Amino acid sequence: TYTVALTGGIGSGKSTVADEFAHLGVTVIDADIIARQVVEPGTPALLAIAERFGPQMINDDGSLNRRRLRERIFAHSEDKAWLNALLHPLIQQETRRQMQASTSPYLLWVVPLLVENRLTDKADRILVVDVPKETQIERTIRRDGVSREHAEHILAAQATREQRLAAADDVIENMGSADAVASHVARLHDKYLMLASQAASQ
Ligand SMILES: [Cl-]
């Protein structure tokens, strides 16, 4: 299936761009969403986490108390492997299920912040969500509860803004009026529909 990679640094707001594509019927594959889905309220995996580590793992709406789980793994690094053994097969199965259930002309793949492979191994086109460096820092401080220096450190460990822009086929600046960002998405959506038709004609 014709695949567009959606990439962007921390604080780029790319999940809001992904949502705009989703609103046009595009299947969005996002490992961060799928990881939350496999431990949703009522799931066997969430029960296993609570039965091992305790009822403090579950908040009052039934969802995972992520910080309490992070604390447990931080105290006992051996429980990383247990958690990966529980969740990794579920994440693989759910990723594949969502891909197989897709009926859209193309797929949008939200690239993780830590990328292991060349994006061109998977993507037919690369879309970078770009914002100024200071916007990344500002948004990360507000959303993630980190200090400025921490945000600057995360940036230093990610691909640079310049490397991301150079690798991109298209760039969407997640800046200015939200209406205009959404119109930019709609314009790119048309380009991707045509490219998917061209790829399928072959
Ligand atoms: Cl292309």
| Alpha carbon distance 89, 34 (integer Å) | 12
| Structure token digits, residue 77 | 């690094």
Residue 190, annotated as binding a ligand:
no
Q: Is 191 annotated as a binding residue?
A: no
Q: What is the phi-psi region of residue 13: left when phi exceeds 0, alpha when psi lies from -120 to 50, beta otherwise?
A: left
Alpha-carbon gap, residue 70 to 90, rounded angstroms: 19
Burial 101-129 (b: 16+ CB within 10 A, else e): eeebbbbbbbbeeeeeeebeeebbbbbbb
Token pair, residue 153, equals 């450190």
In the reported structure, the alpha carbon of residue 116 is separated from the centroid of ligand 1 by a whole-number distance in angstroms of 22
Residues 146, 140: Cα–Cα separation, whole Å:
7
Report d(CA 4, CA 108) in Å as an integer.
5
Distance 169 CA to ligand 1 centre (A): 7
Structure tokens at 49: 């986490």
CA of residue 10 to ligand 1 center, whole Å: 26
What is the spatial order of strands in the sheet that 170-173 belongs to? 27-30, 107-110, 3-7, 125-130, 170-173
Burial bucket for residue 153 (CB in 10 Å: 0-12, 13-18, 19+): exposed
Q: Using an 8 Å Cβ cutoff, are 21 and 28 in contact?
A: yes
Ligand 1 centre from 167 Cα, in Å?
13
- Half-sphere exposure for 37 (CA within 13 Å, toward CB): 14
Resolution (A): 1.4
- Buried b / exposed e across 86-98, counting CB within 10 Å, b at 16+? bbeebbeebbeeb
Cα 125 to Cα 4: distance, rounded to the nearest angstrom: 5
What is the spatial distance between Cα 35 and Cα 23, in angstroms, rounded to a whole number?
Answer: 21
Task: Determine the distance separating the centroid of ligand 1 and the alpha carbon of 64, expressed in angstroms.
Answer: 40
Q: State the alpha helices, DSSP H only, in the chain.
A: 14-23, 31-38, 44-53, 66-75, 78-101, 133-144, 148-157, 161-167, 178-201
Tokens representing 174 are 């997640």
Say whether 174 counts as a known binding-site residue: yes
Distances (CA, A) of 180 to 20, 87, 111, 187: 11, 39, 23, 10
Per DSSP, the three-state class of 128 is strand
Place of tokens 């760039």: 171
